[PDB]
Design a protein around this ligand. Sequence first.
Ligand SMILES: [Cl-]
Ligand SMILES: [Cl-]
Ligand SMILES: [Cl-]
Length: 163
Amino acid sequence: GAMAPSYRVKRMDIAKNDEECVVNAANPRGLPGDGVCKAVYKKWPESFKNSATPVGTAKTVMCGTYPVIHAVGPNFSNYTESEGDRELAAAYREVAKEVTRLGVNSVAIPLLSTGVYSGGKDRLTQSLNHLFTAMDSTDADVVIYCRDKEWEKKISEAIQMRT
Ligand SMILES: [Cl-]
Ligand SMILES: [Cl-]
Ligand SMILES: [Cl-]
């Protein structure tokens, strides 16, 4: 584990992370997709062999010795608010299990279901709070990747508030 497990946020491409593994905001079919998923496909295309997995789950595939954890958040266009919230919490609990199993000291993670899968809502707080619920009991350094300067400020404030 990390000597003093921490949360950090960076505003940059998760495909250029400095962590021991990456979480893909995957689709259930293992397709190249859009946004984070397309950047991950360009960087680690070998990780998409048999990566298909249902909503609410995470499946790890190695690119060389570098683990790619394919985590499938719900598309809120399709799910009810209630069912979508349950599957979003579940996807992050499966990420915590995979990070633990791999024995990594650090992980790069995007906010699941906040892009094309957001159903056109701002889900920063909802997604981040489920990320914390899952990852708080792990001892990996977590580095959250976002693209919007105002999201960076809001995520940074939420981390600092817990101290
Ligand atoms: Cl960048
Ligand atoms: Cl998304
Ligand atoms: Cl963002």
